[PDB]
Amino acid sequence: MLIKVKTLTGKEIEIDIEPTDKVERIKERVEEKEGIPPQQQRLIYSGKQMNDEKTAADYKILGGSVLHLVLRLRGG
Amino acid sequence: KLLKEQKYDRQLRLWGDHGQEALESAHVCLINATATGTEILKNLVLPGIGSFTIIDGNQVSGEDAGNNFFLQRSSIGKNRAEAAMEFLQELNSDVSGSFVEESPENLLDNDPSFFCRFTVVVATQLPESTSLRLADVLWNSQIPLLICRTYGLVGYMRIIIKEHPVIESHPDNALEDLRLDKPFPELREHFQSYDDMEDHSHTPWIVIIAKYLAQWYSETNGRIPKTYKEKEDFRDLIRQGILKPEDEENFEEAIKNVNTALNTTQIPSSIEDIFNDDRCINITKQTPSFWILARALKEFVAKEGQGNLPVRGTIPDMIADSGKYIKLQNVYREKAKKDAAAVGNHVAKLLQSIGQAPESISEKELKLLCSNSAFLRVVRCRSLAEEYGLDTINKDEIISSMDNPDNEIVLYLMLRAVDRFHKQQGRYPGVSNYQVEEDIGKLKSCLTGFLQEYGLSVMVKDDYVHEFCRYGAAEPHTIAAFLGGAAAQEVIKIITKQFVIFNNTYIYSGMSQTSATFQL
Amino acid sequence: LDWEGRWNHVKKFLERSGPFTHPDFEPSTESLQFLLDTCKVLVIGAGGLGCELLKNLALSGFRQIHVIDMDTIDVSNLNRQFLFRPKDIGRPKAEVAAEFLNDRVPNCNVVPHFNKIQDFNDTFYRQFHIIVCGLDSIIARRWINGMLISLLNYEDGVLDPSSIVPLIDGGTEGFKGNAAVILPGMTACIECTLELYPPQVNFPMATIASMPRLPEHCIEYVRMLQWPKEQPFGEGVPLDGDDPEHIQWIFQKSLERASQYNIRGVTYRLTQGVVKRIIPAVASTNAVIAAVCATEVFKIATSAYIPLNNYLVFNDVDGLYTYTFEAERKENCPACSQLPQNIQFSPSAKLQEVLDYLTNSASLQMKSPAITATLEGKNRTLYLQSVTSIEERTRPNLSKTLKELGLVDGQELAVADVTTPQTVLFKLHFTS
Ligand SMILES: [Zn+2]
């Protein structure tokens, strides 16, 4: 599959993924491409915030689908 | 002196001392002290903008005081310019306030070259006519312009800087310049010194991957892990090397890092696009320090760079003994240093051929250009005349976005429709409760006349035509305050040449709470 | 009274109907005065988002406004918290803030509360229609989140709408920010999305003492270790992050340690941030997030438009980016989901085991919990960390096991934590 994932800066990057790959690995792809530690990565697919132990199938991710690296801040 | 480094600590941890100076010495001009204007200022004054001038030929109205935090009832009548200055003045004593009661149009006639004194021009709530004439006057003059608008719950912001180069782009996350794949003499020499152990678990992961990398380079003559399958088998090659299934967490760290350490040496696309730029290639006596550092960089990659930019010099932290990490750290800083020297050497030759003293560009500029060689960015903006010109309009962009009837670019179209309606009517849509009635019709007449004038086959739900009438050229404070913060940061981005500015046009919908950037 | 044209930029939205309106909306002339006279809004925090929020709510037709903030005005506030002047250093942010606003905006009516949010109880919070936050810690957000869920009243299974208090939360951190519109017992709550918070760097004490590498490593040592060892400003005297002579002292011992280890980078400014756990802040961002936040407050209060569904993240570093989405309300929430959670421990599991689960989990992240249960028809304190007298008499039992301490089955435990003010329940399942 060829999926997309907009980073925190709007930059969208593609990935090599088979419906079998865990969320965990999807994150592993982004890092390899961008440098964003999977550790500080929070991916979200259609309101669902993907758990990195489940598979890309568990969320109905179909090729052309788009993921979203999001975040939440402590200050204010 | 030292008292400032105290009230600015919070922003000094973002753009640094230099950022501040740059900021502290700029003189920004604001064109209308309406909420949007007053708020942008509010955000430039606080951080300590050098000085500012507020041009405006209006008199505060009832509504002007009911939505602006820098105009009390006490100032209704007094020129909206002078009025606003006072309250804004109070935010910072280190800032120099100044004002002009002459209208923006009036200065464009009487003294067009007036804006040649400003570092940046921020214009708010201007109608097409003046919005255009100014852009043209400022574009030629080489003056960075930021036009902002607040219409209902829609925030508009158009930046216009012919060329905005930037060295310190400030990337949020980025691939480490480790060079495990294309090691340099001294780096290879480092690994070579490590051997087969007392210090095992306290050895940096980089040295780990390195060592087992060399063991794979052998068995796999030449090849290097390139396939996810191969990378996996590499990970095991490292597992089987666990000294004593006892304690080796760092080995585990290496294993994890193998996902990124095996590919971190290649010239980024954006960088290449700069090398192949006409401004980098053909340097002249007019060429800017940036473009010269640009070439110097390229000349470096060709010769002693050997295909790649200068070694960054930095490395992440990693579980490892003290003395060791430090030495490894040293290997990278000394290398980084050497490369910087080389680049400078090219900069110098380069400078001399242009007819300039090598000391023309500082050593502290070169130090920076090198640690950021991989993050240079350059942002050119289409003029306002272009975006508006019949032949130059960016049709593709508009139509591709419009596939979604609710793609914020609609708001841009409606905004163009409103400005058109303005001319053809002398007034804005639905400002009165009785005007909303028919104005809803007369509007579309313009949304079409507009689209037609540019032959635009896009669908605009009539649901927007209403809304933009419901608005009634209203400048809701919360919507204004939004552009205030967003705009102001852009200005600081410019004044400090220290982050990457947005391209062309930015649109914010308070209704859905979403925004998008465009290139019109 | 209130002058000609003052609320024009607002009236248009309350008098004229429209397309993107909200269902329960109703165009009307009175709306405005009703909004000005009775909508009570509570703003939590007056430190960037705080101030920013007050300005925005006031100029939007809000009159009855209350502010809560326990902090005192410090100089390192003046670059983003515009409601304070250098002549205010020392005073209560809450008070100066209210003071300033009521004066700049004519008949505004901000009531200050020089209190910490945990000082009040449901009684006080039911008082408000909408609550907006601009806090600076996770614990607080969690506490105020829990408070609002207590307010809910379930009509035997069915949730009553009127007992819901909308909670608008905002956050900042450098050029990033995020707003969130919460609806207890309906929308995902703070607890629902507790994992959206990035991780915090926790230096292993081993690399702080035995092997420093970064300057952050040399500072943390002289603060977390050297200081207690040789009391610098008298014995028993704590480390005050806001006292120059303290920081100037650590800055010292740190250069000592750093120099001993050949570590460059130990600046005075760095001793600042590492100690005070400082977060970079500018006005631009706070203005943005607070702005979004107010807009939503205006919407909910008036129905003039449809509230933000769940979230919004903002970012400035690269151009301008803001992603908006609708977070899923976890169905098994230690806070907003109603039915007690289900623990799974083998009858042989010791107490300190059920405890580490809470503390070290991912969906819980409790601070220093306390477990209790109905032991003899009456309920006893299995373990509690808050006090020390109730701590000693209980730690011993931290070693015993499920049945080894009367832990019966087909039962639930009671958890109390500094996190939320409400008590969360866990139904233990002996499946060994
Ligand atoms: Zn929840």
Side-chain angles (χ1 to χ4, degrees), chain A, chain B residues 1-197 200-243 245-520, chain C residues 1-375 377-432:
Chain A
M1 297 199 275
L2 182 52
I3 72 173
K4 281 170 166 53
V5 48
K6 279 177 172 180
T7 197
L8 238 314
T9 77
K11 201 212 213 79
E12 150 199 301
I13 69 179
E14 289 189 304
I15 306 179
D16 264 294
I17 301 181
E18 201 171 347
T20 180
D21 295 315
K22 293 187 175 185
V23 161
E24 183 190 333
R25 184 182 292 292
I26 308 177
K27 282 175 181 182
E28 218 176 276
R29 301 300 168 210
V30 180
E31 167 177 43
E32 190 170 56
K33 229 81 173 308
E34 285 300 355
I36 312 178
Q39 191 189 77
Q40 60 190 61
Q41 275 185 55
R42 304 292 168 280
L43 287 159
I44 276 172
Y45 186 54
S46 307
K48 284 277 187 171
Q49 60 169 301
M50 324 195 300
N51 183 279
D52 56 312
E53 197 63 63
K54 284 182 175 293
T55 192
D58 298 333
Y59 296 88
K60 308 170 186 170
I61 292 178
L62 314 174
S65 51
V66 175
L67 295 182
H68 282 98
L69 275 177
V70 91
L71 190 49
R72 186 156 193 160
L73 313 155
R74 313 163 290 166
Chain B
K1 312 181 189 63
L2 188 72
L3 185 66
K4 292 181 176 181
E5 182 182 51
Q6 278 161 32
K7 77 156 174 176
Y8 292 144
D9 170 275
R10 295 294 134 70
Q11 63 187 56
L12 290 174
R13 300 172 173 282
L14 289 169
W15 47 65
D17 294 341
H18 53 300
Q20 198 54 40
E21 287 179 50
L23 194 62
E24 293 181 311
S25 47
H27 188 178
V28 32
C29 163
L30 163 70
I31 280 314
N32 281 89
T34 313
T36 317
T38 222
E39 297 295 303
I40 300 173
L41 219 16
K42 189 283 285 305
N43 289 283
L44 288 184
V45 176
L46 270 186
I49 206 62
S51 42
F52 76 71
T53 295
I54 299 183
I55 297 175
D56 197 317
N58 295 306
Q59 297 184 294
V60 184
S61 69
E63 53 176 54
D64 291 321
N67 83 156
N68 192 317
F69 196 69
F70 300 86
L71 303 173
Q72 281 180 174
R73 180 175 190 160
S74 57
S75 51
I76 293 187
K78 296 170 71 69
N79 189 307
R80 179 205 289 169
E82 175 192 58
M85 212 211 94
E86 303 193 307
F87 300 80
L88 278 174
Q89 190 62 66
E90 293 181 43
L91 306 179
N92 204 314
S93 47
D94 292 345
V95 182
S96 323
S98 334
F99 79 100
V100 177
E101 297 155 295
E102 311 178 63
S103 170
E105 268 290 5
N106 181 284
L107 286 181
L108 287 180
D109 289 305
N110 284 285
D111 195 313
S113 57
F114 173 62
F115 309 75
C116 308
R117 51 170 84 281
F118 304 101
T119 322
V120 176
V121 172
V122 168
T124 74
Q125 318 303 86
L126 301 181
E128 275 194 20
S129 62
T130 304
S131 210
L132 276 168
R133 200 173 127 175
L134 179 66
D136 176 57
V137 178
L138 292 174
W139 166 271
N140 299 328
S141 293
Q142 310 302 72
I143 300 307
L145 167 67
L146 186 51
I147 306 179
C148 298
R149 191 89 171 293
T150 292
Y151 203 87
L153 295 192
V154 173
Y156 174 85
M157 197 191 300
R158 214 292 201 175
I159 183 166
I160 302 170
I161 305 166
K162 186 171 179 179
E163 182 187 73
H164 183 70
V166 19
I167 301 188
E168 204 173 358
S169 75
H170 279 288
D172 269 57
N173 295 292
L175 284 180
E176 314 289 313
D177 203 311
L178 300 202
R179 309 283 175 137
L180 274 171
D181 44 298
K182 304 185 175 172
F184 37 91
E186 312 82 347
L187 191 51
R188 174 159 351 109
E189 196 162 6
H190 192 56
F191 302 152
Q192 292 185 185
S193 65
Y194 277 91
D195 184 26
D196 290 313
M197 70 191 64
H200 214 72
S201 178
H202 290 174
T203 295
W205 91 55
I206 293 183
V207 175
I208 303 291
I209 281 189
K211 224 69 180 176
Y212 284 62
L213 198 59
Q215 180 195 287
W216 168 289
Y217 186 72
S218 291
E219 311 183 312
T220 305
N221 180 308
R223 308 282 183 181
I224 292 177
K226 185 185 174 183
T227 302
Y228 297 158
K229 172 61 162 54
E230 288 174 52
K231 290 174 189 163
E232 199 55 84
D233 292 3
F234 188 63
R235 289 164 158 68
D236 300 43
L237 185 61
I238 289 181
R239 279 194 158 75
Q240 293 178 57
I242 295 175
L243 182 45
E246 172 71 17
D247 342 299
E248 272 149 60
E249 191 169 54
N250 62 154
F251 261 53
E252 202 74 64
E253 210 179 14
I255 295 179
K256 294 176 183 177
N257 291 297
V258 176
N259 173 62
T260 36
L262 296 213
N263 171 149
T264 40
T265 307
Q266 186 187 79
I267 296 173
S269 162
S270 54
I271 295 298
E272 286 279 23
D273 306 326
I274 295 180
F275 283 0
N276 304 317
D277 184 297
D278 169 289
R279 230 136 139 50
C280 175
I281 293 176
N282 313 305
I283 58 284
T284 75
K285 299 191 176 189
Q286 327 300 45
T287 300
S289 63
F290 177 92
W291 288 113
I292 290 177
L293 294 173
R295 177 66 96 74
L297 223 60
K298 189 175 171 192
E299 297 307 320
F300 174 79
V301 183
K303 203 174 192 177
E304 52 282 71
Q306 296 184 172
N308 315 92
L309 299 164
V311 171
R312 193 166 300 141
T314 71
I315 69 180
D317 177 52
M318 47 186 93
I319 302 159
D321 178 19
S322 293
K324 314 207 177 188
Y325 181 89
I326 306 151
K327 205 174 185 188
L328 172 73
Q329 222 210 71
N330 270 161
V331 172
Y332 284 96
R333 201 171 54 203
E334 286 301 85
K335 175 58 171 192
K337 256 196 57 188
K338 297 182 185 183
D339 278 52
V343 189
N345 260 172
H346 288 302
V347 180
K349 258 160 294 180
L350 216 33
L351 283 162
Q352 287 186 293
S353 60
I354 281 174
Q356 277 182 285
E359 202 57 28
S360 181
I361 287 180
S362 82
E363 168 168 64
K364 310 195 175 183
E365 284 193 70
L366 181 64
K367 294 303 176 183
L368 198 58
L369 166 110
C370 288
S371 41
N372 281 56
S373 46
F375 318 113
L376 312 182
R377 299 291 316 285
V378 183
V379 178
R380 304 212 173 77
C381 296
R382 281 185 45 183
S383 67
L384 185 62
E386 281 184 286
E387 168 182 353
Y388 271 52
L390 288 177
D391 312 303
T392 33
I393 185 183
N394 199 310
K395 297 184 178 181
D396 301 307
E397 172 68 292
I398 298 186
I399 318 180
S400 49
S401 307
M402 274 315 285
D403 296 326
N404 176 179
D406 311 314
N407 171 277
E408 11 230 29
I409 188 83
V410 214
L411 305 177
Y412 169 67
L413 298 168
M414 288 307 310
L415 255 156
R416 296 285 264 88
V418 160
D419 282 323
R420 180 192 189 81
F421 171 110
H422 191 188
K423 209 61 179 183
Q424 181 194 297
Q425 287 285 182
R427 71 175 209 298
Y428 284 103
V431 175
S432 303
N433 281 174
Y434 77 80
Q435 306 185 315
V436 183
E437 183 78 297
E438 290 161 43
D439 278 345
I440 293 178
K442 304 178 189 175
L443 186 63
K444 178 138 193 173
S445 302
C446 303
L447 168 61
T448 306
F450 164 58
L451 299 173
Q452 197 155 55
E453 192 181 11
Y454 294 88
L456 285 163
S457 58
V458 301
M459 174 197 81
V460 176
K461 302 183 187 177
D462 288 70
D463 289 285
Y464 287 91
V465 196
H466 276 294
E467 211 49 276
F468 271 66
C469 273
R470 184 187 176 193
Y471 293 172
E475 183 193 45
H477 189 73
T478 56
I479 295 303
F482 184 94
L483 262 53
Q489 182 44 36
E490 291 310 312
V491 169
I492 297 170
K493 260 165 185 167
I494 301 170
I495 291 176
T496 54
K497 300 176 181 173
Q498 196 162 160
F499 289 87
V500 190
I501 62 182
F502 70 110
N503 227 127
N504 253 291
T505 293
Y506 182 75
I507 299 188
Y508 160 70
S509 167
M511 303 194 300
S512 65
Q513 288 295 4
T514 46
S515 68
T517 312
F518 301 110
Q519 270 173 288
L520 311 177
Chain C
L1 10 165
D2 167 287
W3 84 85
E4 259 303 343
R6 188 183 197 187
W7 309 107
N8 274 326
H9 296 166
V10 183
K11 264 178 192 165
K12 297 191 182 74
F13 301 94
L14 301 171
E15 311 188 320
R16 317 181 184 177
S17 60
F20 301 70
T21 188
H22 176 78
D24 291 293
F25 183 70
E26 272 291 55
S28 169
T29 167
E30 175 205 302
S31 290
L32 171 51
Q33 196 68 53
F34 195 67
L35 178 77
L36 275 171
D37 291 318
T38 68
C39 186
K40 301 195 70 175
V41 176
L42 163 66
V43 176
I44 300 184
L49 282 178
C51 317
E52 205 62 59
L53 269 170
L54 285 177
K55 161 180 69 75
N56 299 330
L57 288 171
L59 296 176
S60 288
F62 289 89
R63 280 278 178 58
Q64 324 309 140
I65 308 174
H66 292 221
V67 192
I68 290 175
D69 194 278
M70 53 169 249
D71 299 326
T72 248
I73 297 182
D74 179 45
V75 69
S76 62
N77 290 5
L78 301 169
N79 80 323
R80 62 187 176 300
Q81 293 162 57
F82 68 90
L83 292 181
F84 316 154
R85 285 307 147 59
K87 92 195 196 316
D88 289 310
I89 297 185
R91 314 180 51 182
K93 291 179 176 177
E95 195 182 61
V96 188
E99 173 205 64
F100 194 127
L101 255 197
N102 297 310
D103 164 281
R104 202 75 122 197
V105 178
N107 294 289
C108 200
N109 200 32
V110 193
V111 174
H113 292 300
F114 183 15
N115 292 289
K116 57 182 174 176
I117 61 172
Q118 294 89 176
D119 277 352
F120 311 89
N121 53 42
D122 58 291
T123 282
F124 170 71
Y125 294 108
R126 287 176 191 288
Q127 167 176 185
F128 311 89
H129 299 300
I130 304 164
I131 295 176
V132 202
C133 295
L135 289 168
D136 60 316
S137 74
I138 293 175
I139 321 63
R141 307 191 142 86
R142 295 179 78 191
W143 195 96
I144 188 62
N145 178 61
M147 185 69 268
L148 299 192
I149 292 171
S150 312
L151 303 190
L152 303 175
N153 181 50
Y154 281 91
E155 310 288 63
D156 288 309
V158 177
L159 183 50
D160 162 27
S162 74
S163 97
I164 297 180
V165 183
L167 166 56
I168 289 66
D169 165 280
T172 277
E173 210 161 296
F175 297 101
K176 289 161 193 35
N178 74 285
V181 177
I182 298 183
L183 299 182
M186 279 204 70
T187 281
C189 72
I190 281 172
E191 228 65 284
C192 282
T193 71
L194 188 63
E195 290 200 74
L196 299 180
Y197 284 113
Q200 54 173 172
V201 184
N202 272 50
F203 305 154
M205 195 245 98
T207 66
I208 297 176
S210 306
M211 52 201 71
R213 307 187 207 74
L214 319 186
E216 277 75 1
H217 294 174
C218 295
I219 301 184
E220 197 66 27
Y221 171 75
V222 180
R223 151 194 172 294
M224 177 199 284
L225 290 184
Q226 205 191 308
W227 179 286
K229 194 79 172 181
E230 61 181 297
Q231 299 303 65
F233 284 53
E235 295 186 294
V237 184
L239 183 62
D240 176 49
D242 289 276
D243 178 43
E245 293 179 6
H246 273 182
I247 291 183
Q248 179 57 51
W249 183 76
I250 302 182
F251 171 60
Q252 201 70 63
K253 298 297 180 184
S254 281
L255 281 179
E256 292 181 357
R257 161 144 277 214
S259 179
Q260 173 184 172
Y261 283 75
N262 304 290
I263 298 170
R264 301 198 175 192
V266 181
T267 191
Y268 175 71
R269 174 174 310 178
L270 188 59
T271 312
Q272 287 289 306
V274 176
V275 172
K276 289 209 280 181
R277 245 55 179 183
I278 305 174
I279 287 184
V282 287
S284 41
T285 304
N286 295 314
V288 173
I289 303 310
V292 180
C293 281
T295 309
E296 290 309 332
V297 173
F298 178 76
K299 298 182 182 178
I300 295 176
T302 64
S303 287
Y305 290 86
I306 10 69
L308 156 51
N309 223 310
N310 269 258
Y311 207 86
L312 153 24
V313 272
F314 171 88
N315 198 189
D316 267 312
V317 294
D318 225 325
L320 267 174
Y321 178 59
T322 61
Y323 179 52
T324 304
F325 71 81
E326 179 191 325
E328 306 282 293
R329 164 187 183 175
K330 283 187 187 177
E331 308 173 358
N332 58 145
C333 194
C336 76
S337 82
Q338 182 164 12
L339 306 203
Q341 224 187 60
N342 304 285
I343 296 294
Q344 300 304 331
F345 278 107
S346 72
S348 64
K350 300 187 177 194
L351 193 61
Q352 246 273 165
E353 199 176 308
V354 198
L355 180 58
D356 281 302
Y357 169 61
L358 312 178
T359 291
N360 304 303
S361 179
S363 63
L364 315 175
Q365 310 190 184
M366 296 192 135
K367 177 70 175 58
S368 172
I371 318 176
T372 41
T374 294
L375 270 187
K378 301 164 189 178
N379 23 329
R380 179 164 65 94
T381 313
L382 291 59
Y383 186 43
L384 183 79
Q385 261 277 57
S386 171
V387 188
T388 38
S389 71
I390 312 184
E391 135 72 1
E392 296 176 294
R393 296 192 172 70
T394 53
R395 189 208 292 75
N397 196 281
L398 258 180
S399 195
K400 304 188 178 184
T401 99
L402 301 179
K403 189 181 179 178
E404 190 189 309
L405 32 73
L407 271 203
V408 304
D409 230 52
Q411 72 160 176
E412 31 153 285
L413 323 181
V415 202
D417 201 16
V418 198
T419 284
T420 175
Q422 59 182 188
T423 299
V424 49
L425 309 170
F426 290 161
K427 298 153 64 181
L428 177 51
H429 278 314
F430 281 179
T431 48
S432 233

